[PDB]
Amino acid sequence: ALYEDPPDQKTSPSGKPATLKICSWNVDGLRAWIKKKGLDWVKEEAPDILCLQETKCSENKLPAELQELPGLSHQYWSAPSDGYSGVGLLSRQAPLKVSYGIEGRVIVAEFDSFVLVTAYVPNAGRGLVRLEYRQRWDEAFRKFLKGLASRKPLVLCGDLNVAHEEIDLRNPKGNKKNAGFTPQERQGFGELLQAVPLADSFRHLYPNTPYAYTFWTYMMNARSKNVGWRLDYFLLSHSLLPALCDSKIRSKALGSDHCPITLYLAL
DNA sequence: GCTGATGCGCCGACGGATCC
DNA sequence: GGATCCGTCGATCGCATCAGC
């Protein structure tokens, strides 16, 4: 069954209008994604903040298009030290603080009224050869997130590399031993929401909506059949739920095997 | 400088067995 | 004997290095 995202709800349930638009995208390689017109999609979406994962591109190699972004001119990049991984954070307004780590996987940006964490969570790998690291990472991430000095509410977004529940992927039965849908990963997502605490923005608004995916394997034309996974999230502190207008899956924006996701907050 | 081979990280389809 | 459950296998992309001209 295919899916079409409901229209954009730009007003919080109390009736206040959105004032912050946040977009997150695993881009499957930034230089490729630019060549496939992904920057055209960003300009059409006009986010206040743009979070990229899997840039596979060090800063000296960022295409020049990236300094032709005047609405997103405060840019911060993090790649591993040892053409793989990599994350990026672009913002209309300069943040108050920017830090990296908890690897080239996490950027922390403090804005006026909240703290944005974008994350590219390590993959448990084919055959699960990296699942134990993932579980160790999950726990270090959690403890890092909880221990964020600021009393400001938390926005965490990006590629979290797990389909939380069976509703979040097409083939839950046959993927229960596969990376991204192990009991160990699902449990990890569960602990994060309660430990921190955090809420799954998309399902707080659409708790029963099936077939909403942010990832489709390139193989076997899985995207055309909407055979996919929900691997990309916005996660909110409980106090930011009143200001939550909508959380979107931009299924039609091409350029990666991940699609963009977008958050509308009313601050 | 540029190309192509190769290596690496990143499951849906399919075949066979069991169950009522 | 249709439905379901289980294990096996081939395979998309982007980017790196390496070899050659």
Q: In sequence order, what DSSP letters do the residues of A42-66 get, joined into one string?
A: HHHH--SEEEEE-----GGG--GGG
Say how far apart CA A49 and CA A70 lie, in whole Å: 12
Phi/psi of residue A24, each to 5°?
-130, 140
What residues pair up with A108 in beta bridges, in sequence order? A99, A117
Whether A204 is a known active-site residue: answer no
Residue nearest to nucleotide B12 (CA to C1'): A220
- The residue from A120, A213, A233, A264 that is catalytic is A120
User: Prior bond to A197 cis, omega within 30?
Assistant: yes
- The residue from A28, A159, A168, A232 that is catalytic is A159
Say how far apart CA A159 and CA A169 lie, in whole Å: 15
Q: What is the CA radius of gyration of chain A?
A: 17
Reported resolution in A? Answer: 2.5
Amino acid at A253: A
What six digits make up the tokens of A163?
A: 């389909």
The separation, in Å, between residue A193 CA and nucleotide B14 C1' comes to: 37
What are the contacts of A134-142 at 24+ separation with CB within 8 A?
A134/A161, A134/A184, A134/A185, A134/A188, A135/A184, A135/A188, A138/A185, A138/A188, A138/A191, A138/A192, A139/A188, A140/A102, A141/A102, A141/A106, A141/A192, A142/A191, A142/A192, A142/A195, A142/A196
The separation, in Å, between residue A174 CA and nucleotide B18 C1' comes to: 17
DSSP state letter for A25: E
> Which helix or strand (DSSP H or E) is residue A185 part of?
helix A183-195
Fold of the domain spanning A1-267: Deoxyribonuclease I; Chain A (3.60.10)
For helices A131-146 and A183-195, give the axis angle rounded to 10 degrees. Answer: 0
| Per-domain residue ranges of chain A | 1-267
Determine whether A123 is exposed, middle or buried from the number of CB atoms within 10 Å of its CB (0-12, 13-18, 19+). Answer: middle
